[PDB]
Design a binder for this molecule. Structure first.
Ligand SMILES: CCN(CC)CCOc1ccc(Nc2ncc3c(n2)N(C)C(=O)N(c2c(Cl)cccc2Cl)C3)cc1
Ligand SMILES: CCN(CC)CCOc1ccc(Nc2ncc3c(n2)N(C)C(=O)N(c2c(Cl)cccc2Cl)C3)cc1
Length: 241
């Protein structure tokens, strides 16, 4: 059994579909808003197993599982996917830096647990009713979010998550543009190897750009940690607001 994590499926209500395994918005005993994912069987629940051990205010929180019946239940993020939010909802630049901080806090927590996300991007973040951004899909090819050492020989590390985070900052400040918008994946990989980097979005100040750009150092060892990035973001937040 999963102890405290076991949820009686009969306490759930189903209110609307969020996506299609299949994900629905609902309630638990009419008390909590929840998101409910429905479904191989064994690898489906591995997501929840990962989430049982990770808990943070800026990380999508597991609420429980239904395995005797198969459901995964989490907190509900009313404003949906961050990528859609950036393209569809409406920002002053200080709200954008806040979104970056939200994600940075989640990633600093993951870093402190020596856990690698491997697919950090705006598509894999969610937004709650208050506009708080949380990292999602962490319990589960993203060429445009990958450093040269990943593209060339699958060298995954804390520093490949750092690279992806810089690209996510770029997504936020560009209001959800696809990175390297005029290139294919193949061309992007080629250009990354040649030292090409994403341009500074108009909404990003030079200080903000320095932060995202620091994530893209050719040498992995020369990229900052999430702890350093968090300190940089806070400093800029204090200086610009
Ligand atoms: C850790 C490990 C597991 C959990 N699981 C968990 N389950 C249900 C709720 C909840 N957390 N939180 C943080 C709320 O604010 N709830 C909540 C909400 Cl979202 C609205 C109204 C009442 C409650 Cl108790 C309901 C949380 C932290
Ligand atoms: C075009 C889309 N359209 C819908 C008609 C607009 C609205 O779309 C929305 C609206 C609200 C949400 N909110 C939302 N909250 C929590 C989770 C979640 N979505 N998804 C998709 C999961 O897989 N979760 C999750 C995870 Cl990450 C792991 C394990 C279990 C779950 Cl439920 C948790 C997401 C999308």
């Amino acid at each position: 059994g999963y102890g405290s994590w076991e949820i009686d499926p009969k306490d759930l209500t189903f209110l609307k579909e969020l996506g299609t395994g299949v994900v629905k918005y609902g309630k638990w005993r009419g008390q909590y808003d929840v998101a409910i994912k429905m479904i191989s069987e064994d690898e489906f629940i591995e997501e929840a197993k990962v989430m049982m051990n990770l808990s943070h205010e800026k990380l999508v929180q597991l609420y429980g599982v239904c395995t005797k019946q198969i459901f995964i239940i989490t907190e509900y993020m009313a404003n949906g996917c961050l990528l859609n939010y950036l393209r569809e909802m409406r920002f002053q630049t200080q709200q954008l830096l806040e979104m970056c901080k939200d994600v940075c806090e989640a990633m600093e927590y993951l870093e402190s647990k020596q856990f690698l996300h491997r697919d950090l991007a705006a598509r894999n973040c969610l937004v709650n009713d208050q506009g708080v951004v949380k990292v999602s899909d962490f319990g589960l090819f993203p060429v445009r979010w990958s450093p040269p050492e990943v593209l060339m020989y699958s060298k995954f590390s804390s520093k490949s998550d750092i690279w992806a985070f810089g690209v996510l900052m770029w997504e936020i400040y560009s209001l959800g543009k696809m990175p390297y918008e005029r290139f294919t994946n193949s061309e992007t990989a080629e250009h990354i190897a040649q030292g090409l980097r994403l341009y500074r979005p108009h909404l990003a100040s030079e200080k903000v750009y320095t932060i995202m750009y620091s994530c893209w150092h050719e040498k992995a060892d020369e990229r900052p940690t999430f702890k350093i990035l968090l300190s940089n973001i806070l400093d800029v937040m204090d200086e610009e607001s």
